[PDB]
Amino acid sequence: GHMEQLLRAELRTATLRAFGGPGAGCISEGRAYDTDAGPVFVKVNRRTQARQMFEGEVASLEALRSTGLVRVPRPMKVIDLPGGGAAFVMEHLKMKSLSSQASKLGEQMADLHLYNQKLREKLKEEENTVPQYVDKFGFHTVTCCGFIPQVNEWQDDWPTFFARHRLQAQLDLIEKDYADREARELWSRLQVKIPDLFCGLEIVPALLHGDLWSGNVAEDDVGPIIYDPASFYGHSEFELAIALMFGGFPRSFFTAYHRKIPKAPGFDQRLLLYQLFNYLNHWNHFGREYRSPSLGTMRRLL
Secondary structure: OOHHHHHHHHHOOOOOEEEOOHHHHOOOOOEEEEEOOEEEEEEEEOOOOHHHHHHHHHHHHHHHHOOOOOEOOOEEEEEEOOOOOEEEEEEOOOOEEOOOOHHHHHHHHHHHHHHHHHHHHHHHHHHHOOOOOOOOEEOOOOOEOOOOEOOOOOEOOHHHHHHHHHHHHHHHHHHHHHOOHHHHHHHHHHHHHHHHHOOOOOOOOEEEOOOOOHHHEEEOOOOEEEOOOOOEEEOHHHHHHHHHHOOOOOHHHHHHHHHHOOOOOOHHHHHHHHHHHHHHHHHHHHOHHHHHHHHHHHHHHO
């Protein structure tokens, strides 16, 4: 069976009539189909690592949806395609661009980073008493930021996790593909200074969307919607690094967010360490074009 007949088999509808345009106006890829059981959105990708990439997104969607705090599209099915790759069926929402609900979202995001912390505090009262806190950084599965199968192996210390499984992840493929001299030299000097940027700070693992830029965030008649997660447990300030970079966010959004999680001492230097990951990752996805920002950033830190 091809794409439409396979979608009909797994969704149990005879209709699957389509509507909408490229990503319904917001999502980068995708088409919307009206089926017997209401509407769905289908994302297609014909690379080999498509299923895994999509299986990472369902874990991400599964984990944010289970906190009740933010509205994400409900995963539905992941169908392997005969011509290579996979299709990912999901609940279809109608989406406007984030304007009025930018106040509501900043506090939804703020709650989401504090959710796992409210869980630890419940377990404290539970222990002394005469739904599960995550004490480590990482994720139970491979979620992808793009088409790079990432590693979310649980590490206990955040600077450790981030340096080896985020930054080194990227500067390794940058060494293989580009053989960039200024990159390896700068990275060897930076890697030692990272521990000095998190002193005077206690970090409680926070569940992150993982790619929260202005183009992965919308709104509804009901409220704000986020989508396209690359989720893991990390440092809440990381979530904002990509959000700032391509700034389509209203000041509404950060006025709310920082009411609950205010900017801690050292915010503005760790901001650079996190935007550094995104610059590297974009170098690897989009070309040498991101070399000037990537290196100018490690230059800046030192």
